[PDB]
């Protein structure tokens, strides 16, 4: 994470170059479909869904399995949650950032003098706005959609 903290720390994580999924996965594409719809039915976003699936269920990655409905695409959790109407409208990361934004703005309301968190607010707001600008360049949001603290409160 260098883009603001400017520290080149490497806590990233690695995936081996496997092209076909391994054999020891005793579940099939429909079974992982059943489990992922169960999981998101239980109220989890993609990151925690995939973590627990690779953790307790053991399947290393759903990206190693090819979507039946398209030969060129490798199956992903987001696509599956899009299949059944369980993907979210506002992309998950940005919803999280809005939630943290309203959180910090409240704490800041009851605490004006901590300019350190003023700067933090400035940071997280540039973050959300960059993500939103990008997604506008892609068009997965309504074009009139634009940040407001108050609707974030409604969020």
């Amino acid at each position: 994470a260098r883009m603001h903290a400017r520290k080149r720390g490497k806590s990233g994580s690695k995936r081996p170059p496997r092209t076909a999924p391994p054999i020891w996965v005793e579940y099939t594409v429909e079974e992982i479909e059943n489990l992922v719809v169960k999981l998101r039915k239980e109220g989890y976003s993609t990151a925690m869904i995939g973590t627990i699936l690779r953790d307790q269920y053991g399947i290393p990655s759903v990206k190693l399995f090819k979507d039946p409905d398209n030969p060129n695409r490798n199956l992903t959790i987001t696509r599956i949650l899009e299949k059944h109407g369980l993907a979210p409208e506002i992309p998950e990361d940005l919803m999280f950032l809005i939630r943290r934004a309203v959180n910090l703005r409240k704490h800041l309301e009851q605490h004006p003098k901590d300019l350190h968190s003023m700067r933090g607010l400035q940071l997280i707001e540039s973050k959300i706005r960059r993500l939103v600008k990008y997604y506008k360049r892609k068009g997965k949001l309504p074009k009139n959609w634009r940040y407001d603290p108050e609707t974030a409160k409604l969020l």
């Binding site: 995936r15 081996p16 170059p17 496997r18 092209t19």
Partner: protein, 129 residues
């Protein structure tokens, strides 16, 4: 942020050479990079090379033969017609035909001497001698 594979590749090659190691592993491997690696190998400046599917971007493994005085990437992709190569050759070579230039042309990226023989201009990408 990594932005240009080729320049990092050729710089990495030269920095291996002035030490003079044997094996180099260009992490940013691309199809155009492989074509380039073919180019000077057809003048044996390098030994064999191989592609390795790393699952992310490929990695090229290359042996050196200790015959690269300097191998730089002309970054601003100057387009040049046939009749004026001697100016650009003199821009990047020590002596008359002392090494090569790699030009991207309508047919496919490769060296400059043949491109004069075939009489097709192009876009300079790299020089080496």
């Amino acid at each position: 942020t990594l932005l240009d594979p080729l320049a990092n590749a050729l710089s990495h090659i030269t920095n291996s050479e002035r030490v003079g190691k044997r094996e180099v592993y260009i992490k940013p491997a691309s199809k155009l990079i492989g074509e380039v690696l073919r180019v000077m190998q057809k003048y044996g400046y390098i030994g064999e090379f191989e592609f390795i599917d790393d699952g992310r971007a490929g990695v090229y493994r290359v042996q050196l033969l200790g015959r690269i005085n300097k191998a730089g990437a002309i970054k601003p992709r100057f387009p040049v017609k046939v009749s004026e190569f001697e100016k650009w050759e003199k821009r990047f070579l020590p002596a008359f035909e002392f090494g090569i230039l790699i030009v991207s042309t309508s047919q496919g990226v490769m060296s400059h001497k043949e491109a004069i023989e075939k009489g097709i201009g192009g876009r300079l990408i790299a020089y080496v001698y």
